Amino acid sequence: EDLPQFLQNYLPNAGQTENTIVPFVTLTYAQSLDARVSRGPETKTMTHYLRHHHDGILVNSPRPIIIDTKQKWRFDGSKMQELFIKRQGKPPIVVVTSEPIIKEQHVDYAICPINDTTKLVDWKKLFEILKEEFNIRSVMVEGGANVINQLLLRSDIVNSLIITIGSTFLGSSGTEVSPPQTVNLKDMSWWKGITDVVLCARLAD
Amino acid sequence: EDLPQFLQNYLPNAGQTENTIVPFVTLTYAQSLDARVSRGPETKTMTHYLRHHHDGILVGSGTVLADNPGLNCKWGNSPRPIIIDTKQKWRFDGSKMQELFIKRQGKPPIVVVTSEPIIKEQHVDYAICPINDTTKLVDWKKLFEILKEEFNIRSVMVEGGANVINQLLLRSDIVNSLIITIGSTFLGSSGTEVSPPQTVNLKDMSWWKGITDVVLCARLA
């Protein structure tokens, strides 16, 4: 709508990550008034517009990037697998902590060593691996509220934050997005729709 | 500024002509992106403009006990403060509210209790509201009726208590307008959140946008 002009300054910017080893990282999600992303229109256009401006998407057409540290996901027999077959959808990059004994066709494996301290995955190292090993110049992370909750803390990684808020309450039992500490924003910009609003911003510090 | 017309349809006297037994009730609060109201300049003025249009301003005790709020109005007379204090632990004597009352800058409070007031304070009015036999908590419908019938409160703005908000969000038979400000900040998951226990659908929504904040006006579906 007027949405492309609104998003423009927050889209991956070529000359900004070029001659760096990190990709542009956008953090994006859709929540209710009570900050829930699940429970216990018009956003299609925007999401698909955003996706086609990124090389990878962490959950032309973007490549799917899946975290599967515990190694239990499978490509064969996935929506993704079928989409790949019909010439409209790329095969996934699968993020793991060690080399899997059994690998699937078309699937790329990114071995990211779990962080020494946090005991979680080293987000900085993972994003460099995606960029350097797999030509992923930009990445749109869409969810796992737990992924979002960690990355909200990473002002040194995240480049743009794009949040849709719908005019509804999902209820307290729904899965929330809220960082463990306070997170300040900068360079904020709001767009308003009929029933929804979108925030574009950056992470302070 | 466009804020007055934006709010116009959601204020008590856009409510047209009919006399009612229930006061007009606006549910209004300010939250972070993570729906938090407590820690873990345009909106402040709006709040005051809103206060100017209501006979009463309601808060749960706890929010009065935490922040020591004036709860009076400045131009965007003043509304009467209404404190829910079922435990009868809030004290008017020595409060900021009392300071404003003495300086003729604010009104004395109405205190809502659920049994005989034990220590009545000078210039304080007490509203004894029945307890709902199902919830064990105060009967919101009867309370608002009493505020109107006994204390001549024709309209009330409830601002405070996540706990209060969380209950009223479920009461489409009580709430006339929902007005929510959302700031562009995260307070963090330790902060106290506003989220009702069940899904709540909204209707008649209209959004307003500032530079750092957005405001939603809606009604309960």
Residue numbers in the entry:
A (entry chain B): 8 to 47, 57 to 75, 98 to 243
B (entry chain A): 8 to 47, 57 to 92, 98 to 242
Task: Cite, word for word, the article reporting this structure.
Saccharomyces cerevisiae RIB7 (ScRIB7) is a potent target for anti-fungal agents because of its involvement in the riboflavin biosynthesis pathway as a NADPH-dependent reductase. In archaea and fungi, DAROPP is reduced at the phosphoribosyl moiety by RIB7 yielding 2, 5-diamino-6-ribitylamino-4(3H)-pyrimidinone 5′-phosphate (DARIPP), which is then deaminated into 5-amino-6-ribitylamino-2,4 (1H,3H)-pyrimidinedione 5′-phosphate (ARIPP) by RIB2. ScRIB7 exists as a stable homodimer, and each subunit consists of nine central β-sheets flanked by five helices, resembling the structure of RIB7 homologues. Here we report the crystal structure of Saccharomyces cerevisiae RIB7 at 2.10 Å resolution and its complex with NADPH at 2.35 Å resolution.
The structure of ScRIB7 was solved using single-wavelength anomalous dispersion (SAD). The crystals belong to space group P212121, with one asymmetric unit containing two ScRIB7 molecules. The RMSD between the C-alpha atoms of the two subunits is 0.3 Å. Each monomer is a mixed α/β structure: nine central β-strands flanked by five helices which are similar to those of the reductase domain of known RBSRs. The most likely dimeric interface was calculated using PISA, and the two molecules per asymmetric unit were modeled in the appropriate positions calculated by PISA. The size of the calculated interaction area was 1,303 Å2. The two subunit interfaces are made up of the four β-sheets (β1, β7–β9) and several loops (Lβ7–β8, Lβ8–β9). There are nineteen hydrogen bonds, and seven salt bridges between the protein atoms across the interface and the extensive hydrophobic surface formed by residues Tyr36, Leu40, Ala42, Leu190, Leu199, Ile201, Ile203, Phe207, Leu208, Val215, Val221, Leu223, Met226, Trp228, Trp229, Ile232, Val235, and Leu237. ScRIB7 has a unique α1 compared to MjRIB7, while EcRibD and BsRibG have N-terminal deaminase domain. Electronic density of loops Lα2′-β3 and Lβ1–α2 in ScRIB7 are missing probably due to their flexibility.
